[PDB]
A paper describes a structure:
The human [name]+ [name] p97, also known as [name], a potential target for cancer therapeutics, plays a vital role in the clearing of misfolded proteins. p97 dysfunction is also known to play a crucial role in several neurodegenerative disorders, such as MultiSystem Proteinopathy 1 (MSP-1) and Familial Amyotrophic Lateral Sclerosis (ALS). pmcp97 is a member of the classic clade of [name]+ ATPases and is an essential cellular enzyme. p97 is composed of six protomers forming a homo-hexamer with an N-terminal domain (NTD) and two tandem [name] domains D1 and D2 (1). p97 is an essential protein in regulating cellular homeostasis from membrane fusion, Endoplasmic Reticulum-Associated Degradation, Mitochondrial-Associated Degradation (MAD), Chromatin-Associated Degradation to NF-κB activation (2). Critical functions for p97 include the translocation and restructuring of proteins from large cellular structures such as organelle membranes and extraction of ubiquitinated client proteins to facilitate their degradation through the ubiquitin-proteasome system.
Although we would expect the [name] mutation to have minimal effects because of the conservative substitution, residue 470 is located at a critical juncture between the D1 and D2 domains. Our studies of p97E470D suggest that this residue is extremely important in maintaining the network of interactions by which the structural changes in the D2 domain are communicated to the D1 domain.
Author numbering:
A (entry chain A): 260 to 707, 728 to 775
B (entry chain F): 21 to 707, 728 to 775
Amino acid sequence: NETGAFFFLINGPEIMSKLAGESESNLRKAFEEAEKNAPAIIFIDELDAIAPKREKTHGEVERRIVSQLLTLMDGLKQRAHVIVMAATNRPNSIDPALRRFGRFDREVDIGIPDATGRLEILQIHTKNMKLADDVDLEQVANETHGHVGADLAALCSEAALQAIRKKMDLIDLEDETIDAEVMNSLAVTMDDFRWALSQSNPSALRETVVDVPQVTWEDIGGLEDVKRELQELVQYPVEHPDKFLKFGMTPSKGVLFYGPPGCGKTLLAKAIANECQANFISIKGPELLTMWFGESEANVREIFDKARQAAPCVLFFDELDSIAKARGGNIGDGGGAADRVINQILTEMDGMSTKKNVFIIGATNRPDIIDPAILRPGRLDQLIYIPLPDEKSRVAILKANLRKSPVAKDVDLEFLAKMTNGFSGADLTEICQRACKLAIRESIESEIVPEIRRDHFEEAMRFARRSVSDNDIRKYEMFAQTLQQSRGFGSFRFPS
Amino acid sequence: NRPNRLIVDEAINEDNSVVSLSQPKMDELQLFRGDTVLLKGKKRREAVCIVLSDDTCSDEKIRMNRVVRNNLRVRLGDVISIQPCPDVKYGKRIHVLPIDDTVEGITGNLFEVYLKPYFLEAYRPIRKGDIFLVRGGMRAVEFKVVETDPSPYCIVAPDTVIHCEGEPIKREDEEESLNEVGYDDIGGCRKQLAQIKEMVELPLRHPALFKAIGVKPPRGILLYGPPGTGKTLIARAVANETGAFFFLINGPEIMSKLAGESESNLRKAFEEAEKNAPAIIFIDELDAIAPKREKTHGEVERRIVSQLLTLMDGLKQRAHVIVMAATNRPNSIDPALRRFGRFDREVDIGIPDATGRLEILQIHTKNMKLADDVDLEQVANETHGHVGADLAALCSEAALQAIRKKMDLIDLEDETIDAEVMNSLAVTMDDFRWALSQSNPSALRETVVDVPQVTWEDIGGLEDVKRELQELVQYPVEHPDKFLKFGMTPSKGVLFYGPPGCGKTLLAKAIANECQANFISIKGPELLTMWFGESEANVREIFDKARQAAPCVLFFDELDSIAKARGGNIGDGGGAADRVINQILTEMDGMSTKKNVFIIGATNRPDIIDPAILRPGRLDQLIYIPLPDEKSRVAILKANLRKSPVAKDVDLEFLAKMTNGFSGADLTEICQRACKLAIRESIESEIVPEIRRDHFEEAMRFARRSVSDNDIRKYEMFAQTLQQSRGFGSFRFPS
Ligand SMILES: Nc1ncnc2c1ncn2[C@@H]1O[C@H](COP(=O)(O)OP(=O)(O)O)[C@@H](O)[C@H]1O
Ligand SMILES: Nc1ncnc2c1ncn2[C@@H]1O[C@H](COP(=O)(O)OP(=O)(O)O)[C@@H](O)[C@H]1O
Ligand SMILES: Nc1ncnc2c1ncn2[C@@H]1O[C@H](COP(=O)(O)OP(=O)(O)O)[C@@H](O)[C@H]1O
């Protein structure tokens, strides 16, 4: 519509609804009809019901229709200036014949929008209607994290409809045509939208979502030594290519995060995505075990392919040693440290192009069970260790954690930093959560005050449980000192 | 705003001429309670009935029955003007006669069987031209007023007498037949019927509202539930009570046609209803229509599916038709029809509970009479695994068995049965109990959803845990402001660990009854079935069932059952990870935290639980249930002995003392064994009707503790290691 070209829509089931021969004639007649009206755009609604030639191998007319479409694709020897377009929800459900050059060489992958993108959808679908002063679209874009752009249209339509059933229920204007002096005055409040949020059922919650986290370096307390190392590894080769091309030395492929659990390895991977203005794909532990238990290790190929087209992007693998713990862990089993899920990842990392704006981050907590096949040069060489937080670093963790909720001034976090010795970064989050629950409990109890008090933190000290034990602390130190081994050669000089 | 017009609504009473109004509403008219009220709606018909009292209906509305709605030719969602009429009026000459459509096959007198036990001590202002239905004689009979003294000033009174000629009349299409289905034929479905009522009222009662505005009304309304729940009944009721044309499309009916004709039927079924707007198009079954999951066979099946798909999204406004479909298996629908614009609204209707089932029995037995010793409260308890259609067959068989028992030796060799004997035919317990045995339920393998009736009064002791559970799932749902202001998210779930028999299932069941939410229970073998069957994808449906049934709570009994199957304490060559729990962990990450759902985990061996579930975001709240104390064991026995009356010499305080390692479940078999002795001695001495003290003394010889003595210390050492509240006793600040 914005280019002045004729638009032709070809529906999927529309072709199939015809009998034998007529469906063949419709595709043929749909091309020269748009050819005379050049320029033109030919759009295909769905391709799953048109060319499902993957495992069907059934029906005599299906293959004929697929071949007719294939012949009409490559048969456009210039002549007109028509551009054919198609849309498929499942990238894997397209026959490779149509993916050949000359028929479909350009691929566009559009994903679920983020909160900023979803807010624009709400603004677009509500531009013709008015809203009250206490109505803000910033809040509704946060809880609808697993909503598609079409879900928001239904949400706002239901919110608008519920207003009629609440304000125009007892009026009963028995008129053949509605007026305008009442429709304009019909406002929509929070109570109308909140009811529609509950009734809305998202239709996309199992696929891998891609989003850029809003967490920055200010939300990570301490660990200033690691931040400079990460900023100096993924930001120079992308913004100083000349110094890398002149010396001819290739940039690093990925980084590995190992250390005690709870130090916040996920935050380090999330913060580097927001600084580089790139995407972020996260894979959890059970996501890897699903393929190992399901005897289907080919699902990771789609995960790797999704990150490539979404350039720039970063790849994150949480607790890669989860499969090793499932087969014995420290004691192991009758086999080695090799499995089938990591085998496919290793094969795919070898074939991936190093010139793309992609990066892989590995996270683990047990470095003694990691397969050594990933440490050899070409796959994963940079190993970053996150030690236990110190006294000077624990104050910043609490200061960053207490930013979302206003606190009082008598809370002396410097004192809480001192008695905490083996407390990790995640070991302090439940303390604040338990302290905050007490404020709500006492407010509701005393309702029949609107500030957190000092006594809330004192009570939460009785349930201070450390997630890490004391025996495994030495195992990380002995591993780190063995890996580094910077002894012997103290300081050597030359005579001249 | 002329405060004399009210909106109609369905009545809650089973009487015919009853008008329900609230106490604050009644004084606005300045009128008394016992009198006659005149109703003026539309189509220049009038109606007069008796007004009653209500206290829970609404701010301003009128509740009127279905039979009185037919006289005014009005439907749900319509406005009606009400005015009083305080005048005394009697009756002199009444001439009424029924229609042959309901009295076909009835002989004998038509006065002492239906007219005398209908108007006695009633004083109902029967208006001229009104149509009323009488229930009795184990059938449905309706009459009509043809001619009488000129209305108004007509009320039935004992002074006047009723006369009838004997010949019936012929009805027209102006009046609606009361034999059809309606909103009063639905029982148990309260939360889910309201969604359909509100989703269909606007685009049908006001077709011109959506024609002018650009709001897109929902088109497809897909229905769920096991076969027999009443998906067709609801579809026909919502079309009959809204004045819209109802079109029924059967599943096998399309398939029975040859090639091409089946294609033409679907196409011709749409514009036929388009001209008769508004209309409702209902599809009986979809399993035989679009089974495009693993079939991949047949050339006409895909063509029919694509034709239906094209007819779905091809409804570019034009008319104001609403298409509806019903499928018993939610998983047996192709994703193409689930796309937006074709089927975006999904309604899941389940098996009704005892209260819902009792309404089904009342609905299906309203035309027949029952004896004084007949109560429907008992039969709604044993039929826990019965569908709404099973109860119709049960009551039909109960009614039929009465004929084979009372009308077996009579042998009335007559061409037409009479009415003086059919009405007198009563149905007793012996007729229903025989039908209960012969009835075969058709739904006993699916996961049933019910709200337990157990409250906190049935749980003895454990008062510390109850407050912790009441303070975790009830504040974030009823104080959202204090959670949104501080910005801190509520807890996802809770874990119950401790010695077996303490009653972890009761804690999860009691929290569902207090929150007025559903309850889904998964036992131990239910988890092992997927682990042994190499099919861990069945838990996705379990998770999805709880979401739509909001609010709901999720319960997982003995989650460590799979760990014990692979070695238990000693384990095996692998770790603590498996495939069943992997899917649960993956699904708990993707579930929306803003829904009114909760997950409760129960276990007895905390030393074999996978630590992957304890990390923040999945399951953080761990609640330990210790051994019951002496002060708590008295309450357990007191709550357990509530179902059966006991004597006063049973000193439970003494029984509390010698019990040391006895858990909550360890005391139930003691009471059961004591109660069995009473029955045994009553039957033995038959050739007394109270439990005696000596019954409990004998049961003490078989007092077996389910828990051993070695595992008691393992729970204490685990709890003290988990808590570890030593060291920091009491710290203060200098200033
Ligand atoms: N260094 C840190 N600074 C601030 N917050 C932290 C830090 N480490 C952990 N957290 C908090 O602890 C929570 C749990 O982190 P977790 O998932 O245990 O990290 P990891 O996966 O690296 O062990 C996170 O929500 C995070 O906000
Ligand atoms: N919830 C219910 N209340 C009253 N009657 C019911 C109910 N469910 C089923 N029935 C009765 O069962 C009969 C058969 O219903 P059926 O067509 O099997 O329903 P569905 O199509 O939903 O399986 C109907 O005539 C109906 O009267
Ligand atoms: N604290 C209690 N108070 C009352 N009854 C109890 C209690 N604990 C257990 N029971 C009774 O014991 C019976 C068996 O419970 P059980 O299934 O062993 O619980 P769990 O599954 O938690 O071990 C239940 O029917 C329940 O009525």
